[PDB]
Amino acid sequence: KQCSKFIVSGHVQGVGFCYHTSHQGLKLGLTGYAKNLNNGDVEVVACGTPERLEELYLWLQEGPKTASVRQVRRLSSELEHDYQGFEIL
Amino acid sequence: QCSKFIVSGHVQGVGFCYHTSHQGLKLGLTGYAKNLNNGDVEVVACGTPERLEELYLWLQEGPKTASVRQVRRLSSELEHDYQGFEIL
Amino acid sequence: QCSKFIVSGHVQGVGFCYHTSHQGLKLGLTGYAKNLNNGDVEVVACGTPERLEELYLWLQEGPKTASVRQVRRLSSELEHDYQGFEIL
Amino acid sequence: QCSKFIVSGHVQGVGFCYHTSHQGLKLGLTGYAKNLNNGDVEVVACGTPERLEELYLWLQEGPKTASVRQVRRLSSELEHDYQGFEIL
Amino acid sequence: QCSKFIVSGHVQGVGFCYHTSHQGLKLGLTGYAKNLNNGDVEVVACGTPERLEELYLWLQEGPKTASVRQVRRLSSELEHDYQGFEIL
Amino acid sequence: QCSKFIVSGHVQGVGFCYHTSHQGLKLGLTGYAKNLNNGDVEVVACGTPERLEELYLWLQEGPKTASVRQVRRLSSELEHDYQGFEIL
Amino acid sequence: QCSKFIVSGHVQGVGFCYHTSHQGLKLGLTGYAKNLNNGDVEVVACGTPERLEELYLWLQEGPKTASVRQVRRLSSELEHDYQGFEIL
Amino acid sequence: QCSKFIVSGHVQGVGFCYHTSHQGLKLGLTGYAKNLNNGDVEVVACGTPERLEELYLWLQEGPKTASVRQVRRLSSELEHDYQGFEIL
Amino acid sequence: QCSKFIVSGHVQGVGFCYHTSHQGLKLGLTGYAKNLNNGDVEVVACGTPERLEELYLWLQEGPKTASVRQVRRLSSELEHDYQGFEIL
Amino acid sequence: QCSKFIVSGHVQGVGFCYHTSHQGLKLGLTGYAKNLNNGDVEVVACGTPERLEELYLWLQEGPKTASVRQVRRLSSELEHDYQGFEIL
Amino acid sequence: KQCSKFIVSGHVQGVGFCYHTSHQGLKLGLTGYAKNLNNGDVEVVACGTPERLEELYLWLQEGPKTASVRQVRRLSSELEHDYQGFEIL
Amino acid sequence: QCSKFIVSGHVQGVGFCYHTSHQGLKLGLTGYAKNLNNGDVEVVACGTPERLEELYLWLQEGPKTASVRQVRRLSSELEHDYQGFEIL
């Protein structure tokens, strides 16, 4: 059990993205949230096992989705909180 | 803008609504999928046009459990802001 | 004690429904304000005929963001208790 | 296995929708009873046709507060799980 | 209009509140049924007076679990829309 | 005090659970009606023992839509404060 | 810093409770407006005493639908953080 | 059985109601801790008596944030089932 | 028309219950996927036999996070209207 | 399209957030007003740029309880659909 | 991270126990449920680190609580489901 | 009278947030304890200076599951009303 943070940028809000991401997590058994940042980015935080975070990291990059994902930056995270489901904002 | 879709076929009771709304929330669309009495499903959807085109094309060709016979996009001029994508 | 109102004009997405629902909750009225596919807003409101007149007036010339062109009062024989003043 | 009904007379604000849902839910049915502008009540039940018959009969002869002049069955090709027995 | 009722006897925790709220919703009434620290139940119900008479009768001789001993109709000049028929 | 009731017959799908939970709430009881896999309906109900005989009897001969074939009184040593009368 | 007010006149079912709570929340205040049997409205606010004076005045002179005969400040010794500005 | 407790002191705004209901729920009690206008807190509690004693004892002596001055128990009777232990 | 399925393997905490729920919802079904002590999921779906077949297939073969070992079909008699598609 | 506003002054606790969300929902906007640790209130508002200039105006000159010193317009590049006009 | 199950028996329902337990668990960072069984017992399932499951196990035993706890029997559990908070029933 | 508090150590996933929120509710306070990315909890509480003091104390020396290292007091100018005691 471990949580990662990711900062996705590009055409990423308003294009079903925080939903798809949410949904895609829950499907991988993850918990977290996708939050809409003011710059235009989406900050996604998920927690599960590391290979389930890889799969999401992989989805976040190349996955089939409406959004035009220009970059995903993984960030180190020390939060070990039990998030409920996978929430938007 | 908002578009309206009459779907006719074997559309009620086959997860059609759930699926349609799933598909829409994934495109960034807002609207509803209402069960009509005749047997059709009405689908109202708002987003950017190219997105509603996507949705329209799914309603027609998209892989689903339902047996879609026709997809008529009716015109009309609603400019309300819908909540999510609900099933009425 | 309910009346039906068919507000036409630039009335969707321009706070008209939140605003109307508020203005009628202040008159002690109940009912709804539902958005219609042609671009109109169907406002149904229940109360004493006098508060109805205040509200009919308010729909026309009151201050509001919306550009209201025409308000057509319609008859209604409707005796159900509406809880609050919902949107749609 | 979903029927439409139009009930007419003195039938709104007289508990009718509510009692109707209650009678339906006892029969094991799901659907709604909606208040219509003209005064009439659109009740849509769903279940086994005998139960749907049972509700037709209650809609006609059943001890109730409302004064029911006419109950007209209409046809429905609604093929949909309705949650409870809503009032609308 | 609204009336207030002060039901006394073995009338608490014996279904009486649920029952009255049910029975009142079937007459198309609104209001409440509140448990009082002396053991009585306060029933406020709002409707047409004839329905209120029906309910007033119901409280007395109606079939119901509770052993009612006395019902003292009070004045009440309250004109507030009560949503449904609550408990407490 | 609480009791356990295993009812069998034509009891699922036929509004039995709601109707039971209704009768319960009318006699002042608290409990649940759980739909079992075998096709039986497990009813747990709590209150004064006399009221539990009324329910145990209504479970047998009480007018209802379900076709009750057998009612099985099981020994329960539970003492939990149950919410309303939930359908499970 | 919580006052109690008893407002009297034609004040119930005339949007007064609702307009009051709105005016309150605009002012920064928390409390309720409760409908009383005799007819009067029990408004209880909580804030800084200026905002409390502002509301006093609004209750008296404020443009509103109701006809306010009397407003009697009535002194409270209560601290409890009321969450919103409820209607009761 | 239910009991009533008027607690006077520095009891409002000091977690007294929260803490009281926390303590009750831990003893298996149901009821409510209502802030009164004078400044006291009413506490209605139901359970086995030996539990109401415990609460009464905690109410008086129990470690808390509030500054209790007098703990009067009043007339028991009142035989309702309260949902949880609430705060109002 | 309600089939029960005991799914086994690495099937808890892997999104399977969510996922299974989304698939049954996509096929027009209602039911639940509950997590069992042994490590297993019991999924209970109710729809048409063919829709129940698509699902039994998916549980087996469908793309999913989990590592299914074995899906057994157990027999059921439950004829109850499950709400949506929950997770327990 | 969206915009960002940092309002500073005597703006917290004086009903500013509410009143802002009210003007907001009146102009048809969506967004939020978030109370900041520094003492300023961050308002985000989404809609037609003319309605934004209306809100931006009202944030300065608008009749309100708050004592507004300065209103800073920031770059918001946002695009997210916001629900109501929430208070954070 | 893991789950255990405990069957606590004695005078255990109607005496604030399922509330206290839920509460005690939540304070230990655990999630699970306290379920009222028909026999008179209380089934408690809780999830977290094993030293946090000890603390609850130890609580359940000697901890000060209204109930009259006669026996606590720990049972083996293979469930690894994310439970939301700590629920009663 | 709204203090902010950055707590650190092994303080996430250890029931701290729940527990802090319960201590603060016991002290008659409102506010939140939110989990931060670095590992830290930021607890924001609002009440009377001394109540904010017992909390500051408890945060440090109070019995709790967590391993607190350092508690810093910070800021603040929040003059906002916070609901209950949340977790973020």
- Counts of helices then strands in chain I (DSSP H, E): 2, 5
> Angle I25-I27-I33 (CA atoms, 0-180°, nearest 5)?
45
K39 among known catalytic residues: no
Selected from 3.30.70.100, 3.30.70.20, 1.10.1060.10, 3.10.20.600, the CATH number assigned to the domain covering A1-89 reads 3.30.70.100
Q: What is the DSSP letter of F47?
A: S
8 Å CB contact of A66 and B27: yes
CB atoms within 10 A of CB L60: 12
**First-to-last C-alpha distance (Å) of chain K:** 22
**Side-chain-facing half-sphere of A88: CA atoms under 13 Å:** 19
8 Å CB contact of F30 and H83: no
Contact present, L5 and L43 (Cβ < 8 Å): yes
8 Å CB contact of B18 and I29: no
> How many angstroms separate the Cα of L82 from the Cα of each of C14, F80, G81, J68, L15?
31, 34, 10, 22, 21
Strands of the G85-87 sheet, one edge to the other? G67-73, G2-10, G41-46, G31-35, G85-87
> How many angstroms separate the Cα of F67 from the Cα of each of D55, F7, F11, F12, L51?
18, 10, 6, 10, 63
Residue whose structure tokens are 């090709």: D77
**Side-chain-facing half-sphere of I37: CA atoms under 13 Å:** 11
Structure-solving method: X-ray
Going by C-alpha positions, the residue among B82, B62, B81, B84 that lies closest to residue B7 is B62
Contact present, K48 and K31 (Cβ < 8 Å): yes
Pairing of strands L30-35, L85-87: parallel
**Domains of chain K, residue spans:** 1-89
- Smallest Cβ distance to E19: which of F26, F51, F54? F26
Going by C-alpha positions, the residue among H56, H27, H52 that lies closest to residue K66 is H27
CB atoms within 10 A of CB K16: 22
- Verify cis geometry, omega within 30 degrees of 0, for the bond prior to L76: yes
Find chain J residues with C-beta within 8 A of G51's C-beta: 14-15, 65
Distance to chain L for H14, nearest Cα, Å: 4
Question: Whole-angstrom Cα distance, residue L56 to residue L71?
Answer: 8
Q: Is E45 exposed, middle or buried (0-12, 13-18, 19+ CB in 10 A)?
A: buried
8 Å CB contact of J12 and L75: no
Contact present, C84 and C30 (Cβ < 8 Å): yes
- Smallest Cβ distance to K84: which of A1, A29, A84? A84
Per-residue DSSP letters for J23-45? HHHHHT-EEEEEE-TTS-EEEEE
Question: Whole-angstrom Cα distance, residue D22 to residue J49?
Answer: 50
Contact present, E26 and D18 (Cβ < 8 Å): yes
- Rounded to 10 degrees, the C-alpha dihedral H14/H16/H18/H24 comes to 160
| Tokens representing residue F81 in the block | 């404060």
Contact present, H26 and K66 (Cβ < 8 Å): yes
Distance to chain G for C28, nearest Cα, Å: 4
Residues 6+ apart with CB under 8 A from L86: L21, L31, L32, L33
Question: Whole-angstrom Cα distance, residue B15 to residue I54?
Answer: 13
Strands of the B41-46 sheet, one edge to the other? B67-74, B2-10, B41-46, B30-35, B85-87
Question: Whole-angstrom Cα distance, residue F42 to residue K88?
Answer: 20
Question: Whole-angstrom Cα distance, residue B33 to residue B11?
Answer: 11
Residue of H nearest to G5 (CA): H37
DSSP lists the bridge partners of residue C32 as C44, C86
| Tokens representing residue J46 in the block | 């989404």
Residue whose structure tokens are 């939110």: L34
**Side-chain-facing half-sphere of A65: CA atoms under 13 Å:** 28
Question: Whole-angstrom Cα distance, residue F10 to residue F16?
Answer: 9
Strands of the E30-35 sheet, one edge to the other? E67-74, E2-10, E41-46, E30-35, E85-87
8 Å CB contact of L18 and K27: yes
Catalytic residues of F: 35
Contact present, D59 and D71 (Cβ < 8 Å): yes
Q: Is D83 exposed, middle or buried (0-12, 13-18, 19+ CB in 10 A)?
A: exposed
Find chain B residues with C-beta within 8 A of A19's C-beta: 25-26
Pairing of strands F2-10, F67-74: antiparallel
> How many angstroms separate the Cα of J41 from the Cα of each of C2, G24, K86?
42, 19, 36
- Provide the number of CB pairs (under 8 Å) joining chain C to chain D: 18
Contact present, K31 and L15 (Cβ < 8 Å): no
8 Å CB contact of G78 and H17: no
Residue of B nearest to J83 (CA): B83
> How many angstroms separate the Cα of J28 from the Cα of each of B37, J3, J50, J64?
33, 14, 11, 19
> How many angstroms separate the Cα of C47 from the Cα of each of C16, C56, C62, C80?
20, 12, 19, 11
8 Å CB contact of E38 and H77: yes
Question: Whole-angstrom Cα distance, residue J23 to residue J28?
Answer: 9
Going by C-alpha positions, the residue among B73, J86, B60, B22 that lies closest to residue A16 is B22
- Provide the number of CB pairs (under 8 Å) joining chain A to chain I: 21
- The active-site residue, picked from B8, B12, B35, B82, is B35
CB atoms within 10 A of CB D48: 14
Contact present, L26 and L84 (Cβ < 8 Å): no
Strands of the J41-46 sheet, one edge to the other? J67-74, J2-10, J41-46, J30-35, J85-87
- Smallest Cβ distance to H13: which of G4, G44, G80? G80
Residue whose structure tokens are 């209950």: L84
Pairing of strands F85-87, F30-35: parallel
Find chain F residues with C-beta within 8 A of I3's C-beta: none
- Smallest Cβ distance to B76: which of C13, C17, C37? C37
CB atoms within 10 A of CB K26: 19
| Tokens representing residue J64 in the block | 């309100």
> How many angstroms separate the Cα of B45 from the Cα of each of B31, F33, I25?
4, 40, 21
Going by C-alpha positions, the residue among J79, J5, J87, J19 that lies closest to residue J46 is J79
Chains that touch I (3 or more CB pairs under 8 A): A, B, D, F, K
Q: What is the DSSP letter of E48?
A: -
| Tokens representing residue D58 in the block | 């209650």
L1-88, what's its fold? Alpha-Beta Plaits (3.30.70)
Residue whose structure tokens are 């807190």: H41
Question: Whole-angstrom Cα distance, residue C11 to residue D47?
Answer: 41
8 Å CB contact of B30 and J83: no
Distance to chain E for C19, nearest Cα, Å: 21
Residues 6+ apart with CB under 8 A from F36: F42, I78
**Side-chain-facing half-sphere of E81: CA atoms under 13 Å:** 22
Q: Is B53 exposed, middle or buried (0-12, 13-18, 19+ CB in 10 A)?
A: middle
Question: Whole-angstrom Cα distance, residue A52 to residue I19?
Answer: 15
Contact present, E28 and D14 (Cβ < 8 Å): yes
8 Å CB contact of K66 and H28: yes
Find chain H residues with C-beta within 8 A of L27's C-beta: 14-15, 65
Interface of G to H at Cβ within 8 Å reads 4, 44, 76-81
> Angle I53-I58-I59 (CA atoms, 0-180°, nearest 5)?
100
Contact present, C33 and C19 (Cβ < 8 Å): no
> Angle F44-F50-F55 (CA atoms, 0-180°, nearest 5)?
40
Resolution (angstroms) stands at 3.1
**Side-chain-facing half-sphere of A32: CA atoms under 13 Å:** 34
Q: Which of K15, K38, K39, K41 to mutate to test the interface with F (most CBs of F within 10 A)?
A: K38
Contact present, H61 and H7 (Cβ < 8 Å): no
